[PDB]
């Protein structure tokens, strides 16, 4: 309360919010536990030359299939309005 004055102070519900520290709670540990089983760190990240290769080879493959995915998205959205979708009929 006191919003907009020199008496402004945090309301009660903000104080309660900051009283919830979630000490000793980890609801996302499953994600990291399962991610670690991919062994990406042991195989690629730990060694600098392999870390570079991951960025290069990943960027190569990632860039190609990223382009491929959105090209299909474009073709679906503009279905029936593309030059390839409407073969031209020559006048007689």
């Amino acid at each position: 309360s006191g919003f907009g004055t020199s008496y402004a102070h945090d309301p009660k519900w903000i104080e309660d919010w900051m009283a919830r520290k979630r000490v000793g709670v980890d609801r996302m540990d499953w994600f990291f536990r399962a991610f670690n089983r991919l062994r990406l760190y042991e195989l690629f990240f730990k060694s600098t030359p392999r870390f570079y290769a991951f960025m290069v080879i990943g960027g190569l493959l990632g860039s190609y299939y990223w382009s491929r995915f959105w090209e299909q998205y474009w073709i679906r959205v503009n279905k029936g309005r593309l030059y390839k979708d409407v073969p031209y009929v020559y006048p007689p």
């Binding site: 060694s47 030359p49 392999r50 570079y52 290769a53 960025m55 290069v56 080879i57 960027g59 190569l60 190609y64 382009s67 491929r68 090209e71 474009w74 073709i75 593309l82 030059y83 390839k84 073969p87 031209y88």
Partner: protein, 84 residues
């Protein structure tokens, strides 16, 4: 004691071979960097090769059908002879 001095003199006889080995071990540690260098080169030089070499270099994953819907040469979108 001269024998001891002979051994102490001779323990560095093979300096050139030892320094060669040292550099050979630095070069051994640098060989893994090829794993990223070579694909990066072919990644930048991909557009330089002919289409049949593009297809072979990618094991057939890339081919003419994979060229973008709007090819940088619009007269060759959908193939060398156009869509139809």
């Amino acid at each position: 004691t001269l024998a001891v001095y002979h051994r102490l003199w001779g323990m560095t006889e093979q300096f050139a071979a030892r320094k060669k080995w040292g550099w050979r071990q630095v070069y051994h540690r640098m060989l893994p960097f090829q794993i990223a260098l070579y694909p990066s080169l072919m990644w930048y030089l991909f557009g330089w090769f002919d289409d049949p070499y593009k297809e072979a270099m990618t094991l057939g994953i890339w081919n003419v059908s994979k060229r973008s819907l709007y090819f940088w040469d619009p007269l060759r979108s959908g193939g060398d002879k156009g869509w139809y």
